[PDB]
Write a protein that binds this ligand. Structure first.
Ligand SMILES: Nc1nc2c(ncn2[C@@H]2O[C@H](COP(=O)(O)O)[C@@H](O)[C@H]2O)c(=O)[nH]1
Ligand SMILES: Nc1nc2c(ncn2[C@@H]2O[C@H](COP(=O)(O)O)[C@@H](O)[C@H]2O)c(=O)[nH]1
Ligand SMILES: Nc1nc2c(ncn2[C@@H]2O[C@H](COP(=O)(O)O)[C@@H](O)[C@H]2O)c(=O)[nH]1
Ligand SMILES: [Mg+2]
Lengths: 165, 180, 170
């Protein structure tokens, strides 16, 4: 696949989409749990966890999948895997890794264009909040995995896509 | 124009300044409001290094009044910085109401207006125009309501500016990176 | 010398270790003040000795050091932190603190100027987030950046590492 990263309000979405282009058929994997976009989304696009079920081997090369976003997906999983003070951050990481490996696998075998969106969350200062701190570590480790797995990697800054790989 | 971004103490000020260089007449546009002796004391070093052929203005509204169309193509303008301006606008807007009770949707809409104007100005200005902004969203989601919103807002302003820019540079550890 | 920067868990360390290579003899300078560490060691080669210090690096970064040998410093930000703490965080004279910090930076810098061995320093990007409410953190974050510029300016090669991907900026 293709991995797009960047800070909040970096324009990574727009860049991802720009990566999608027309693209005949487009599957949007919208990971946030609901605790304006759905409107700007072309009517043609479909909107959809249990991700490997979507990222299939029997798709078209002209087809395209957009997952938004990896971070969120990470978050949902911890909680799912889970109060965060009794948490064994270590075990959590591993499990998370399993999952990511699964995504990778799926993406690996998927004939469609796959574009994954994630965020850079650790160019800031060490947070005081443990989960927060934990969180940031795991997310970075997840990104490395994806990146390594990725074919192309972009970093978006101020809406400017920078192809790092 | 040229857009220059980086985190705090990235060296973007100095890189910006380098972008301008030897220009005969320079106008430094300074958007900070000194709300402390600390904030004031530091602006000091800024001035202290400022040149004689550089005029300062202590402004952050209507730069359209500053970034002008009769300007000489050999002259330059350095605006420092977007983020402050944005922060300046945000509390203006906010008024004597708590940030809590703020209408970020509104504010952001009002914010875009002033940005649009700025872009137009920069677009119609024959002089070299450099703007300094900050990268503030490479970290963890902010607990504090505003902050969280200000971060969104900043990012959006950034995109626009960048979009508009003829040139963009990311400066890391004092190292300028031309991304556009 | 080589400066490698990036954020927390950006794969900068791996990248760093990668610049080191099959460096026969390597000195690992761990600035962290003390389990998490237990393992770092654990995954550290045999022909690599470790020096736990964040002061007088000039004591380790020597002129006699063999070219084909290397130094891996990890990490600058930490060092910084300890430094500040060396010098109540509210009643701190930041301007002064910072100057001392730079004194130590200059040492480090001159040291790497005459060390014939490969010197790699690892630091982090920490000013790409929002302005902190905490006054130390604000200053820390401020000192941290100035320190990076100096090093970067001193370094021969500068790499920004993103999501495990290395970007050569200098
Ligand atoms: N739940 C949900 N999130 C969406 C949708 N479209 C975009 N986003 C979500 O909102 C975030 C971006 O704003 C992403 O994390 C993404 O998961 C959608 O249709 N549903
Ligand atoms: N009000 C005001 N702010 C200034 C002046 N010179 C620089 N600044 C502010 O100083 C900022 C940069 O901070 P500095 O470069 O310490 O660390 C810019 O955001 C700019 O608005 C000046 O003469 N007046
Ligand atoms: N004190 C100390 N810190 C170490 C040692 N080995 C690695 N580190 C520290 O580990 C830090 C990175 O943390 P980590 O990724 O292992 O949890 C580096 O900043 C470095 O100072 C060691 O033997 N002693
Ligand atoms: Mg997005």
């Amino acid at each position: 696949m293709i991995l797009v990263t960047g800070g909040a309000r970096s324009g990574k979405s727009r860049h991802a989409e720009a990566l999608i282009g027309d693209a005949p058929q487009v599957l949007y994997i919208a990971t946030s749990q609901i605790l304006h976009h759905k409107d700007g989304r072309p009517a043609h696009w479909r909107t959809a966890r249990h991700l490997d079920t979507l990222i299939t081997a029997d798709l078209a090369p002209d087809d395209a999948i957009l997952l938004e976003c990896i971070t969120t997906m990470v978050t949902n999983l911890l909680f799912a895997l889970g109060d965060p003070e009794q948490w064994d951050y270590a075990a959590m990481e591993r499990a998370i890794d399993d999952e990511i490996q699964i995504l990778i696998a799926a993406c690996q075998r998927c004939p469609a264009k796959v574009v994954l969106v994630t965020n850079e969350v650790g160019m800031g200062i060490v947070p005081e909040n443990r989960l927060a701190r934990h969180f940031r570590d795991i997310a970075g480790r997840v990104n490395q995995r994806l990146a390594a797995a990725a074919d192309e990697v972009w970093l978006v800054v101020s809406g400017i896509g920078v192809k790092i790989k």
